């Protein structure tokens, strides 16, 4: 099985910007860079495992994803 | 295999301050050493708005050539050359002229 290391490779880096900060503090969403393909299912699974958090939904040259967390958040 | 090291008592052989003793602070890869209290240079430090604002004139230490200093014998009160010898398989430094271990 190679789903594991695939999840370790879809995330690339987090995006930092005033819109990103505003989204995090208001809507509890974190925006981060992802792989070129980085389908929503893979992004959701990767965030679950690596950050051990719960995500409401993910909506997505480079690709960025606005990962939405539930009420409980860590980082 | 360097004669001058991090902590050594050395005496200047040549320059404007020949004869004054001192302790080496660090040695540069370019065959230069920094010894405090002899090679004072008045550097006009440009002010900066960063966390540090010393400005004014600073009294820094200017590096000198390794060959310009020698290890002080501390027993004969004069400069002396230093060589290497193997003892119990460990390389050590030793003076000349009644050579004794450091």
């Amino acid at each position: 099985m190679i789903r594991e290391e695939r999840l370790l490779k879809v995330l690339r880096a987090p995006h930092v910007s005033e819109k990103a900060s505003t989204a995090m503090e208001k809507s509890n969403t974190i925006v981060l860079k992802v792989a070129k393909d980085a389908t929503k299912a893979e992004i959701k699974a990767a965030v679950q495992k690596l950050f051990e958090v719960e995500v409401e939904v993910v909506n997505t040259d480079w690709k960025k994803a606005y990962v939405t967390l539930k009420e409980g958040q860590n980082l | 295999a360097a004669k001058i090291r991090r902590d050594d008592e050395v005496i200047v052989l040549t320059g404007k301050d020949k004869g004054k003793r001192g302790k080496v602070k660090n040695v540069l890869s370019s065959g230069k050493v920094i010894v405090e209290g002899i090679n004072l240079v008045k550097k006009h430090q440009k002010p900066v708005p960063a966390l540090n604002q010393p400005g004014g004139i600073v009294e820094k230490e200017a590096a000198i050539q390794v060959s310009n200093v020698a290890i002080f014998n501390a027993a004969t009160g004069k400069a002396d050359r230093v060589g290497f010898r193997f003892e119990d398989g460990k390389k050590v430094r030793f003076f000349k002229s009644n050579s004794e271990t450091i």
């Binding site: 987090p14 930092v16 495992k49 690596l50 980082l75 | -």
Partner: protein
């Protein structure tokens, strides 16, 4: 530390390799990007550790 994990079994050494990547590697990168990582030498240290663990897995597993 280089020989400390040289006598570890594959399962446990695979686990610490997992932990090295999950914690202290992903978290550090977020802190550095966000700017709260005062000390950067951790990124160098963790990356070398991951490489050191990874080579042992290949050296042990298979050949």
């Amino acid at each position: 530390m280089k020989a400390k994990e040289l006598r570890e079994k594959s399962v446990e050494e695979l686990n610490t390799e997992l932990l090295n990547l999950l914690r202290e590697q992903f978290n550090l990168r977020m802190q550095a990007a966000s700017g709260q990582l005062q000390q950067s030498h951790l990124l160098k240290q963790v990356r070398r550790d991951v490489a050191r663990v990874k080579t042992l897995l290949n050296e042990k597993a298979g050949a």
